[PDB]
Structure formats: structure tokens, C-alpha cells
Amino acid sequence: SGFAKMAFPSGKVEGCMVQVTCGTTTLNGLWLDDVVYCPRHVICTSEDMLNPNYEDLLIRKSNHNFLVQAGNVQLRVIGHSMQNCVLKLKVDTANPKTPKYKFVRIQPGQTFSVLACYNGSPSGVYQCAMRPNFTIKGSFLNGSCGSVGFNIDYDCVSFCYMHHMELPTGVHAGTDLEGNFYGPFVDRQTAQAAGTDTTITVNVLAWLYAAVINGDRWFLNRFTTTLNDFNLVAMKYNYEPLTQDHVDILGPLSAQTGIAVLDMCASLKELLQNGMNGRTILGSALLEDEFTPFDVVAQC
Amino acid sequence: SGFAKMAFPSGKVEGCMVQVTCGTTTLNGLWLDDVVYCPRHVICTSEDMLNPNYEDLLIRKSNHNFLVQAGNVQLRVIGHSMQNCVLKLKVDTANPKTPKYKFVRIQPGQTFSVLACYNGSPSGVYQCAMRPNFTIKGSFLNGSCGSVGFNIDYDCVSFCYMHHMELPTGVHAGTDLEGNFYGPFVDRQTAQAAGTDTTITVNVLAWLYAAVINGDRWFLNRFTTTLNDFNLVAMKYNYEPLTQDHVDILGPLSAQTGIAVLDMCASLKELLQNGMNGRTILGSALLEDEFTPFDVVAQC
């Protein structure tokens, strides 16, 4: 059949991508109905970004600061308000190709598609996960600020991320459309670090359950194990511990494969204890934690 | 900055995706202007596919066989011709959202974006490479037949693949829009195998040159080496040998990093000889051969 890490298609969200500028500052914005959302840190220069007071910087910005372009065409800003770290620019036009949308806040574990833009012109897309420590292993270059993370469930567009800033580490932070940052992070250039990255365990399990269906099944053992016992092994190797929900959610996989989730844990457990002796599952030599059981089911 | 395997956006090609059916047979087609392309094996059932004569099977098909739907709406077929393994259905309508397009035949080495469809309804997209042995490690389920592989260079759409068939191995074959199969493969269900899979070496090199720029540079040695010497090592481990072009193409990377390509070969060479002792380059424990130097440059 085949397995690959896979983004939703991007036609809908491409419809909503605009360029914004505020002096020398040029980033990406999202045009939904009569509104345009974008990172608020657009009103900053470099000298500002150290300790910026947004209350106080935007007190000094006018609607005639905010150049907003719709590809070839331009828009006219008609009122500027700031919600947390996102800036909501009202304009004269409603997006003619605004489609069924909704803002969601995702939880650390879920995955989403990302549309990397540069001057409102989308460049690319890739599937991505919301790390334990509320970060993302992304591809983000200067003025990818305002590029977004979405999903598509039954026509509706499920906007869940908007990018703000890279980190000294090199992983990327950003908010939802509420404007609230995923994590303890704020938009300034102070020595921010991100906590311990661990592995989305439930997901790896779904990735093994995947592997099986795709035929690849060298790594299967006989063993059973307790949940706790499995966990008292897993957490040693920086992995997320595992709940009765996790099992519940991994239920439909365990059906199609006639493999119990307990028996899969001791199987995984034994990869952690032993290693891989340089073999590959679904052609990978690391354990792949960026698949939710919904991702993998949908892929099948 | 960040690195991720990355597909072009899919809005353009989504515009051109249609469902086709021919009795009980339902696959994906591509509507460009007044034409619709699709895999010809759509005129087959299962009993046929063993040894089908297409000349002779289509002699028995009419325009009123060919149900062709445009999402909600339907089309009217008005003449059916077969070019190699692709079938060209003329219809009454030209695609209103046909954009600047061109058919290209890619060469074994190049990468492209893939739009997986089911009943003309796109499900997903992922970046993919045209293997040495003219195969692809894909995600393709029944009736992904007619899902396509494209690229975008400066507005133009560069259609380069259309899927036909999985293989007993589990990798996927298909043609260009010419209709000619990438590889020695034909559309029937005989015991087809695919030759030796080797590694797109130039690409791995571009993936190392990537790694460096992204800061990750544990794996650097001092050494130089000859091209031939490098090759007399590489080919042992099933890798594609390396040409003066390959070097030429890897030229602009070698500029930005102040690292000679010769010195990069002995560096790679030493991963092959030694291993990795379970470290990671750009967070991967296998060497990543699905990036062309154009991919990686564009990503930067």
C-alpha cells in the first residue's frame, strides 16, 4: 500500500494568504472574511524587539502604516486591534474565497499541515507535530512569520497554529488564532530555552501498528507486560507515559492486526532496551513519533 | 532555520482533479483544457488485467461507458483515444481553472510533489523521489490510480508522473503524460520485480551540505579523496557513482559552506565505512537521499 508523512492539501488556505508590511517589516497574514490576522510583532523593528511594549508601540501606529497586499492587488485597512500576540486588521473587503473555517487550539501531541509563505506567496507544505515542550521541528526562514498550521476535517478548515519566532535551539514557537502562545513563550529576543523534548509515545505505537499492516513486522515479540511496567521502562528513555485513553484510542488498530496493545508495548519496550541493531521499520532507523492514530487510520 | 521534506502547494493541481469510471472501475483523472487524462487500465476489470489487449478491449468501449465527474458536476465525453498507457478523453468543457502547465519527463534522481486522490477528491500530498530503479516509495491505496506527481517552477505546473500500479514489492510504478512507463514495466498482473534500489548519492551530499548550513556538523572530517577512490568505496555499498556534473551541481553549496566537495566525499565515505554509532544528522539516523540540490537551495 505504502506509508509516507503526509500533509493535507493547501488550496483552501492558499486562498487566505496575504502579505503585510509595517515600515521595513514584511511578514505573512491570513485573510478571513473582513479580517486579516498576523503576528503582532510586525510593528517592531530590531531595536524594539528586545523589550517591546506592544500597548505602547501600537499607540503610535496608524491604519496608514499597514500595507496589506492580496497578491497583485492591495487592500485598505480600516481599524487595528491587538488580541494577545495576534493583530486583527479590519479591511474594506471580505475574502471572496473564504471557505468553511474554524479556529482550534491543538493539544501537545497532535499533528497538522504547515504552509510556509514568503511575502504572502506560499512556497511549500509539510506535516508537523506539536512537541511535548510546545515547539515544532519546522522549516522557517526570515519572514516565514505569519505562516500557518492547519488541518482539514470534512470540508472545514481547522486553523491551529500561526508562527512567530524561531528559538536559539532552532525550533519554532507561535500561537493559535486566539493569539495565545503554545508554551511559556513570548515574542521578544531574551534568552528563551525550551524544556525537555520527549517522544510522543502513543504516536510511535500507532506507527508500529502502521508498520505491521504494511507487512513490515520483524520487530514483533511474544511478550506481554503491564502498563505501569512498560511505563517504568519508557520514561527512563524520555518518553511520554501512556494512559487508558491512549490504549482506547489505539483500540481500532489492535483490532485490524489481532495484536494486543500490551503485547505491542513490550515489543516497543524491547527496541528501547536493545536498540535496532541497525534495522529499519517502514524504512526508518529512528522511531517515528509524528503520527497520531487518526493520521494513520485516515491513511488507510 | 529548520529543515523538513517539503511538497510544493497543491491548489493548482486540485483544480484539475476529476473522478472517472468505466463500469465497476473508478479511478482519478486529470482535466486540462478540453482533455482528461487517466490510466488506460480503467477499461479493464480484474479478469482482464491478467493479459489485457488494450487495442482490442477499447474497440469494445463507447463514450457512454465513460462517466467523468467534476466534483458535484458531471462532464460529457465526446471521443476516446489511447496514447501508450494513458487514455485521452475529449469532453465538451475546457477546464475553467486550467493554469499554466507543461508535461515533463523527469530523470531517475529528481523529486516531485504527489497528490493522492480518491474519486477525484484529493486526500493528501507528500514529497517523493524517482528511484534509481524507476519506482517510488509512496502511499497509494486502491483507486489512487490516476493520482499525479508534479512540480512548480515559476507559476508553470510541471506534470511528471501519473500512477498506475503498485508492485509485489509494495513500491509504485506509473508513466509520464506522454504515457510511457518509467522503467521496463507494463500495466498487467504478471510477476514483475524492480531492480536493485541504490542511493541517490549526489542527493545525500546535498543533504549533508544542508546539514552543515543548519549548523549540525559533528560528521565532518579533515580528509580529502579522489573522485574515483570515493566511488570505489561508495559503489560497494550500493550507491550511485558521482560525475563531474554532480560536482558542478553541488558547486553553489560548496561555496556557501567553504567546504570542498572532495572533502565532503571522504566525510560521507567515513559514515559508510564506520557507520553512525547511532548519532543523527538533521535528526535522522539514515542518510537522506530524497533531496536534490535544487530542493535544498530553494529551501534556503
| Residue B12, min C-alpha distance to chain A (Å) | 8
Long-range own/partner contacts, residues B260-265 (CB < 8 A, 24 or more apart) = B260/B224, B261/B205, B262/B224, B262/B225, B262/B226, B262/B227, B262/B230, B263/B221, B263/B222, B263/B223, B263/B224, B263/B225, B264/B205, B264/B208, B264/B209, B265/B205, B265/B225, B265/B227, B265/B230
The neighbour count for residue B14, using CB atoms within 10 Å, is 19
H runs (alpha helix) in chain B? 11-14, 54-58, 201-213, 227-234, 244-249, 251-256, 261-274, 293-298
- In angstroms, what CA-CA distances link B71 with A10, B68, B120? 17, 9, 7
- Give the number of residues written for chain A: 300
**Bridge-based pairing state of the strands A77-83 and A152-153:** unpaired
Are the CB atoms for A166 and B2 separated by under 8 Å? yes
CA–CA dist B134, B274 (Å, integer): 30
Cell numbers at A1, concatenated: 500500500
Catalytic hit among B16, B22, B38, B41: B41
Q: Tell me which residue in A4, A8, A298 faces B138 most closely, judged by beta carbons.
A: A4
* Interaxial angle between packed helices B227-234 and B261-274, expressed in degrees from 0 to 180 and rounded to the nearest 10: 20
Instruction: Mark yes or no for CB contact B125/A166 under 8 Å.
Output: no
Place of cell 517592531: A44
Stated as kind and residue range, the H or E segment containing B112 is strand B111-118
Q: Which fold has domain B15-91?
A: Thrombin, subunit H (2.40.10)
Are the CB atoms for B52 and B85 separated by under 8 Å? no
Strands in A130-222 per DSSP E = 148-150, 152-153, 156-159, 161-166, 172-175
CATH (residue range B201-298): 1.10.1840.10
Cell numbers at A91, concatenated: 479591511
CA–CA dist B141, B97 (Å, integer): 27
- Written as one string, the DSSP assignment of B207-274 is HHHHHHHTS--TT--S----HHHHHHHHGGGSB----HHHHHHTHHHHHHTT--HHHHHHHHHHHHHH
Q: Tell me which residue in A9, A127, A300 faces B10 most closely, judged by beta carbons.
A: A9
CATH (residue range A99-175): 2.40.10.10
Residues of chain A found within 8 Å of residue B300, distances taken between Cβ atoms = 141
Residues in a beta bridge with A214: none
* Interaxial angle between packed helices A261-274 and A201-213, expressed in degrees from 0 to 180 and rounded to the nearest 10: 100
Are the CB atoms for B262 and B227 separated by under 8 Å? yes
- In angstroms, what CA-CA distances link B181 with A69, B84, B106, B125? 44, 9, 11, 22
CA–CA dist A217, B68 (Å, integer): 40
Of B150, B182, B189, B149, residue with least CA distance to B166: B189
Q: Describe the strand order of the beta sheet including B101-103 as a list of residue ranges.
A: B101-103, B156-159, B152-153
The neighbour count for residue B137, using CB atoms within 10 Å, is 18
Cell numbers at B297, concatenated: 537551495
Are the CB atoms for B147 and B163 separated by under 8 Å? yes
Of A16, A127, A149, residue with least CA distance to B116: A127
Instruction: Mark yes or no for CB contact B139/A14 under 8 Å.
Output: no
Catalytic hit among B16, B145, B160, B265: B145
CA–CA dist A111, A130 (Å, integer): 6
CA–CA dist A187, A91 (Å, integer): 25
Place of cell 462517466: B67
Q: Is A124 helix (H, G, I), strand (E, B) or coil?
A: strand
Q: What values do phi and psi take at B179, rounded to 5?
A: 115, -5
Stated as kind and residue range, the H or E segment containing B176 is none
CA–CA dist B154, B200 (Å, integer): 26
Q: Is A128 helix (H, G, I), strand (E, B) or coil?
A: strand
- In angstroms, what CA-CA distances link B38 with A36, B11, B49, B65, B113? 40, 20, 16, 14, 18
Are the CB atoms for B281 and B275 separated by under 8 Å? no
List of residues 6+ apart from B42 with CB closer than 8 A: B20, B21, B22, B25, B27, B87, B145, B146
Are the CB atoms for B173 and B135 separated by under 8 Å? yes
Are the CB atoms for A152 and A9 separated by under 8 Å? yes
Most distant CA atoms of chain B, gap in Å: 69
Instruction: Mark yes or no for CB contact B6/A116 under 8 Å.
Output: yes
List of residues 6+ apart from B89 with CB closer than 8 A: B20, B29, B35, B36, B37, B38, B66, B68, B77, B79, B80
The neighbour count for residue A256, using CB atoms within 10 Å, is 12
Q: What's CA A300's distance to the chain center, in Å? A: 22
Cell numbers at B262, concatenated: 572532495
Q: Catalytic annotation on B41?
A: yes
A vs B: CB pairs below 8 A: 120
CA–CA dist A183, B51 (Å, integer): 60
CA–CA dist B210, B215 (Å, integer): 9
Are the CB atoms for B266 and B230 separated by under 8 Å? yes
Instruction: Mark yes or no for CB contact B9/A5 under 8 Å.
Output: no
Active site residues of A: 41, 145
Q: What values do phi and psi take at A175, rounded to 5?
A: -115, 180
| Residue B121, min C-alpha distance to chain A (Å) | 10
Within 13 Å, how many C-alpha atoms sit on residue B37's CB side? 23
Q: What's CA B204's distance to the chain center, in Å? A: 17
**Bridge-based pairing state of the strands A111-118 and A148-150:** antiparallel
Are the CB atoms for A175 and A85 separated by under 8 Å? yes
Q: Describe the strand order of the beta sheet including A152-153 as a list of residue ranges.
A: A101-103, A156-159, A152-153
Cell numbers at A276, concatenated: 535496532
B286: closest chain A residue by CA: A285
Q: How do the domains of chain A map onto residue ranges?
A: 12-91, 99-175, 201-298
Place of cell 489512487: B144
Confirm whether A12-91 and A201-298 share one CATH topology.
no
Q: Which fold has domain A12-91?
A: Thrombin, subunit H (2.40.10)
Are the CB atoms for B202 and B140 separated by under 8 Å? no
CA–CA dist B286, B267 (Å, integer): 15
Residues in a beta bridge with B125: A7, B115
CA–CA dist B88, A60 (Å, integer): 61
- Chain B residues bordering chain A (beta-carbon distance below 8 Å): 1-11, 14-15, 115-116, 122-128, 137-141, 166, 170-172, 214-215, 275, 278, 280, 283-286, 298-300
Q: What is the DSSP letter of A93?
A: P
CA–CA dist A234, B286 (Å, integer): 23
**Bridge-based pairing state of the strands B26-32 and B17-22:** antiparallel
CATH (residue range B100-175): 2.40.10.10
CA–CA dist B35, B179 (Å, integer): 14
Are the CB atoms for B183 and B135 separated by under 8 Å? yes
- In angstroms, what CA-CA distances link A171 with A25, A69, A129, B28, B212? 22, 29, 12, 38, 16
Place of cell 495576534: A86
CA–CA dist B145, B148 (Å, integer): 9
Long-range own/partner contacts, residues A214-221 (CB < 8 A, 24 or more apart) = A214/A1, A214/A2, A214/A3, A214/A282, A214/B170, A215/B170, A216/A281, A216/A282, A218/A279, A218/A281, A219/A267, A219/A270, A219/A271, A219/A279, A219/A281, A220/A259, A220/A267, A221/A263, A221/A266, A221/A267, A221/A270
Q: Is B296 helix (H, G, I), strand (E, B) or coil?
A: helix
A122: closest chain B residue by CA: B9
CA–CA dist B75, B64 (Å, integer): 11
Are the CB atoms for B198 and B238 separated by under 8 Å? yes
**Bridge-based pairing state of the strands B156-159 and B152-153:** antiparallel
Say which amino acid occupies B24: T
